[PDB]
Each structure stands twice: as structure tokens, then as C-alpha cells.
Ligand binder design. Structure first.
Ligand SMILES: [Zn+2]
Ligand SMILES: [Zn+2]
Ligand SMILES: [Zn+2]
Ligand SMILES: [Zn+2]
Lengths: 406, 406
């Protein structure tokens, strides 16, 4: 009677206006709803995102097939099953699909089911999602993440001269999540001021993740601009910088000069996705100052991660749940990486929804790191606000931040 | 035992990164959470939005006072009360405040309580929010709204030559909300194409409501551009245009020429907020072709509306819940306007959250009109997705659209 009563999928819109999959699992504890995020990326090592390719609906981007797979294949298999058995049910769905890349059912059919199950299970246990996921991960200490706010784009993400994809600011010396979020917002607002004054009113329109694409011609206005923003808002010394080079899109000393001159604590994809040797060199070169994050390198792929660990190619995992497509697998990859000395930065996609799962997930992993947007656009602020709520439930002795950056 | 157990307020961030108020009302049916939207506007006739003015937090934009008013004054008054008695509890909160403009407690303290009460009450009655609100409004027939998608800014909203604030597209000849939303997205995506080709990659960064601010120098590229977008996406003949002149920011024949040459079905604030005589003239001139929407004119103010009705100054109400600040008052203003022949267009603010109340509210009023953003940014798409869910619950015979535009 305490088991799964109904499983239903539907198409919804993501924050770019493209369809994605949302899944509701219904038990006697209520209706538990989860939506799947989406990137513009592909991705030979990513789990399969299934699109319709009907040029008459959403120019080939419909998710009716993925939704049908939920409604007619996974759903029927889940009815009457005990939602508490996460591993068992995720493994079930892996075996239902039967392919190494989730190419049959679609990772975007399976993931919504995986997430909504875990929410129904947390409710059945009488604890919030983050607590339930922490039990699943064996996490000894919960913690609120320092948020890494996307603030200047960025290569393929802007029409400007800049070769690298993202410049983030991170309130690492904040002592609480509440404080971290207000600091991030305050610097984001002075940055907007600085950009408006230099480049004009239109220059403060925002990219997909809520950050700006100012017309920077000077490939090093951006880092000084970010320091200026941090000063003006009043938080000198309280912030670090995180970069995403997405260097594949362009394909070491330069990286040393920026880290030495600025407080850069993190650089994601500094080299091409197959330049394991170059990755390894920069990881060694900046060890203990600047962490190196695998994204296009690792693609939340189990064998790519095992590779990276073995070759010491990076020391931080970017965790995109939709890239692997089950919660049991995502947690396993987080645990594995942490066991080998790595940090984990939980991540949004460019195509996000009002869903807030990654807020509870980053807390539950206790990783101290989340990349979920600028403090702007509701598909980013939904996460940041969920983190405020989690912090409030945990009370004043709740741990904040990434120990290495504090 | 079925009554209010806990009332708690907190600051959260809106989609611009500014603080606002969220309220949770807890009953034995669960925890019911509502957040308050915010405009950049003021607003001598609007209910009072209370800000801290502490220049050290969020440059004077903190909502700690409003939150304290929830926590220490309204909350204590609501504990142990029957959440089903909407009118009684909203009137209670009006009397607690005691001022005509809600200047004591703040409309942004009262409104979150008003909304969260109604949600706790809907749960107690065992119906979704839209059904419960329809009973409160005495609405005979529910309907899904045509969504009016903000697509080109717009006066104070862009650095371009354009004097008027917003150009919207409305899928009025869609036969279902699902269809309306896909059409809106499809035209938004071809529009992005058109703008990218004419004005470049940076030109498709988005404003506060998810629409674009292309550098239009030609004060009539925009309407042709919108027709081009509608054609290319494949929906010739299926769309209307809605405009917001926000003409106060600049302070008739021209309006006739645009309506005659284009399918403009709606023009909001065509004149200055006190030019009642000019409002009346344009309402008469375009009666039965183009509705005229009061926003700065009416400001969701009870006496301003009574004025407008008496002088036939407009024939459509823009309904901003946070501008009046209770649900009983908002509904009363909707009913009054409809009784005098008016339409009601339920509206977002520029500062929105992940909250989706206005989705259920527009259905519950059965007004056939909502302005809640482009199909872009999660604080807009959260509403549009909630409307997809409502439609799914209502089934295939659910009414769609505004009868006059279908
Ligand atoms: Zn990209
Ligand atoms: Zn990346
Ligand atoms: Zn404005
Ligand atoms: Zn307006």
C-alpha cells in the first residue's frame, strides 16, 4: 500500500524554451515531480538524450518518444514496486534499457524516474531529500556548497574576443550559505554597473545561465573587471575566481600566470577532451592552488572517470546527472572520485528547469561546490533559494563551503 | 486540528537577484509555500512594498522588515485559525495593517500569507488551487489563457530607438494550451534566428522577461520582424500582437494605423497614467478590434479601477497581485471589471520567482489572458509549465483562449 501507484511522463519547456521530460511518481505520500535538464552538447561519451527529430514540432527537438518510454515501458515496470529500493530500481531501469549508453529508453526517460523515485522514498522515510540522498551516499557530514556564479561569457557563448567559455565568482570566504548568496548577488549587481558604464545598456542582457556577454575586445579586461566588481560591492578578499576554458572549442604557462596574479581556485577543461597528458601536467603544476575540473574530459562517464583517476588527469569532477542518467550511478561516481582525493562540483545544464534536485544533491554529497548559474534567471535562483531553505533546516552550526578554499 | 500550525517568512532571491519575501503556512496537510513578485515601479497608487533601506545589505533592498512582520505580527495572529476562511483572513490582515496602502505591515508581508493560506485551504478541501480559487471567484467556466509572450523590448527596457516598452506575440488561433505554447516557442526560436542574422550573436541575449533587445534603429522594423518570425516558424494567420506602450515613459492615429495594418489585439498603457481623456478616446476608437489595457493607469488600485470603469478609460485590467496585496482584493477587482464588460490579463512582474500562483489564478478567473514572459527563463517557463499541468488535469474538452480573439 506504501508502494508506487502511478508513473506518468510529460513534455515541459526548459529555460531556453526547448522541450524536456518531467516525470511524476505517485505513492500514498503524494505526487513527486522531477524534470530533466539538457545541454547543447554531444557527446559520444554522454548517456543518450532522446529527441523526436520531427521537424514539424520544435524543429526536431520534441521529447514525445522519451515520454512514451516513461509512460509505456518504465512506468508499467515500476507500478507496485517499493520506492525505497533505489539501487534496485535504477538497476532495473538500466537492465530495461540494456545498452551501455541508455540509447534504447533514453537517459532523459530514465533520469526523471530515478529522481522522482528518490523523492517518493525520502517522503516515505519522513526526511527531506538531501537527508535521504546522504544516507544513499554514506556521506558522513552534510554541507552547504560555495556557489560558483557564472558571470562573464565566454568563447562560443559570446560574440566577444574571449577564447574561454566562462568566468565565475565564488564567495569562498563567506561563513554561511545565506552570506555567500547575498555577497554573490551584491557583486553581480556592481558588475552589472561596471559593464553598463563601459559598454552600455544592452551589454547587461544575459546569457543562458544569467551571466553577461559584454563586448570585451581586450582578452584581459575580464579578470580585472571581476576584481573591480568584488571591490566596489565591498568584498575585497572574500572571493575566488573559477574558470571554464572549454578549451576543446579552441583546439599551461598562461594558466600559471593567471593563477599566480589572481585568486583563481578552479579551471575546468583547460585542455582538449582527449589531451589527457596536458590535463595531467596542469593538475600537477597547480596542485594545492588551483583545482582542475573534468567536464568534456570526463563527461560524467564511468570509464572516462576511471581513466582520469588512473592518469591523474584532473582532480575535480563536474557532475551532470543527465549525462549519466541515474541517481545510483551519479552517487557512485561522486563516491569513487572523493575516495581518490577528488572534489566534486555538482552542475546545472544550459537548458535548466524550475527543478531543484541538484540543490539537495550537492548538500547530500557534502562536496562544498556547486555551479548552478548567476544569481539571475529563475531556473538558477530556484536552486540557490532551495539551498537557503536547506541551510535554514540545518540551523546555525551547519557547515559551509569547501574546506580547501575557506 | 485541521487549522494553521505554523507561519514562517524568509528572504529569497528573485529572478533579477534581488531579495523578496516567501511565506510558508504549515497545517496537518503539509507545508504551503508562496513567494511575492516585485517590479522596479513606484507607484503612489500601488500597495506598499516594504524594503529595508540598509545600504550594507543588497544596497537597501533587503526584505528583513517585511519578513519580521510576517514572523512576529501576522504569523502569531494566524496560528490556530481556519485556513478555509479566505475573506475573513485577508480582511484580518487588512485590519492588522490598518492603512489604505498596506504601508504598516507591507503588501509584500501580507500577500505571501494570503497566497499560502489559499493553498493550505485548497489542500484541506482536496482540490487543486485553481479549483479552489474558482469557487472563491464564482467563476462559472474555467479556461486555459492565451499566453502573451514578451518578445521585443522596448523604451526604458532597451538601448534601441524604440519608444514603446514591449512587443508580445499571442497564439490566439491555437486550439489548446499545449499547442499555444509550442507555437509560441517555435516563433520565439525563428525570431531569435532572424535577430541573430540581422544584428549578430550578442543581440539574442535576453531581457528580464526573456525577450530580446535588438538594436532596432528603425522604429518600424519590429512589427514586420514579428510577422516574418510568425511566417518562418509556419504559423501565418495563427498569431496576434500585444503591445505595452508604457507611454508615461514618453510623456492615437498612429495606433489606428498599426492596428489596421497588423493584427494588434491589445495595447497596454497607450497614454500617460493620468490622461484619462486620451485613454477613453482610444478605447472607443478601437472598440471590438483592439482592447486597451490599464497598467500604470489602474495599478491594480480599487479606486483607480472604479474611475476607469466610470469614465470608460479602458476595457481591460492588468492584474498584478503584489500591487493590491491580497487574494480576496485581487479577485474582487477581477469580478468587478468582468461585470462591467472588461477582460482581465493576469500579469507577472519583472522581478519574478519560481512561484507559479498566477498560473492557477488565471485559470481560476477564466480570463483567457496571461502575460507571464517569453518562453524563456525559468521564472517565466515555471508558469507556462504549470498551465500545461492544469490543462492535462482538465482533459481534452478544457476550454482554451480568449473568445474574442479566437
Ligand atoms: Zn555551449
Ligand atoms: Zn564545462
Ligand atoms: Zn520597467
Ligand atoms: Zn505595463
Amino acid at each position: 500500500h506504501m508502494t508506487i501507484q502511478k508513473v506518468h511522463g510529460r513534455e515541459v519547456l526548459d529555460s531556453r524554451g526547448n522541450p524536456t521530460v518531467e516525470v511524476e511518481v505517485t505513492t500514498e505520500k503524494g505526487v513527486f515531480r522531477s524534470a530533466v535538464p539538457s545541454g547543447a552538447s554531444t557527446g559520444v561519451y554522454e548517456a543518450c538524450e532522446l529527441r523526436d527529430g520531427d521537424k514539424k514540432r520544435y524543429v526536431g527537438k520534441g521529447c514525445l518518444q522519451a515520454v512514451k518510454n516513461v509512460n509505456e515501458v518504465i512506468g508499467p515496470a515500476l507500478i507496485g514496486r517499493d520506492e525505497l529500493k533505489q539501487e534496485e530500481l535504477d538497476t532495473l531501469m538500466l537492465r530495461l534499457d540494456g545498452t551501455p549508453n541508455k540509447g534504447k529508453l533514453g537517459a532523459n526517460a530514465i533520469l526523471g524516474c530515478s529522481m522522482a523515485i528518490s523523492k517518493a522514498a525520502a517522503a516515505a522515510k519522513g526526511v527531506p531529500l538531501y537527508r535521504y540522498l546522504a544516507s544513499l551516499a554514506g556521506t558522513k557530514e552534510l554541507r552547504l556548497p560555495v556557489p560558483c556564479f557564472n558571470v562573464i561569457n565566454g568563447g562560443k557563448h559570446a560574440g566577444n574576443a574571449l577564447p574561454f567559455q566562462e568566468f565565475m565568482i565564488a564567495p569562498v570566504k563567506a561563513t554561511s550559505f545565506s552570506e555567500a548568496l547575498r555577497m554573490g548577488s551584491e557583486v553581480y549587481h556592481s558588475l552589472r554597473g561596471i559593464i553598463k558604464k563601459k559598454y552600455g545598456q544592452d551589454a547587461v542582457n544575459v546569457g543562458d545561465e544569467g551571466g553577461f556577454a559584454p563586448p570585451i575586445k581586450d582578452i584581459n579586461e575580464p579578470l580585472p573587471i571581476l576584481m573591480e566588481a568584488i571591490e566596489e560591492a565591498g568584498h575585497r578578499g572574500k572571493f575566488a575566481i573559477c574558470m571554464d576554458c572549454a578549451a576543446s572549442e579552441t583546439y599551461r604557462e598562461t594558466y600559471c600566470k593567471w593563477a599566480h596574479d589572481y585568486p583563481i581556485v578552479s579551471i575546468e577543461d583547460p585542455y582538449d577532451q582527449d589531451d589527457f597528458a596536458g590535463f595531467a601536467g596542469i593538475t600537477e603544476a597547480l596542485k594545492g592552488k588551483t583545482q582542475i575540473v573534468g567536464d568534456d574530459l570526463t563527461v560524467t562517464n564511468t570509464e572516462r572517470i576511471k581513466m582520469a583517476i588512473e592518469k591523474k588527469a584532473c582532480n575535480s569532477l563536474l557532475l551532470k546527472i543527465n549525462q549519466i542518467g541515474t541517481i545510483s550511478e551519479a552517487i557512485a561516481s561522486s563516491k569513487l572520485c572523493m575516495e581518490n582525493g577528488w572534489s566534486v562540483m555538482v552542475s546545472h545544464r544550459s537548458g535548466e528547469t524550475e527543478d531543484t534536485y541538484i540543490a539537495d544533491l550537492v548538500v547530500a554529497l557534502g562536496s562544498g561546490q556547486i555551479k548552478t548559474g548567476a544569481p539571475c534567471r529563475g531556473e538558477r535562483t530556484a536552486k540557490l533559494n532551495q539551498l537557503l531553505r536547506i541551510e535554514e533546516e540545518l540551523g546555525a552550526h551547519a557547515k559551509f563551503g569547501f574546506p580547501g578554499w575557506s
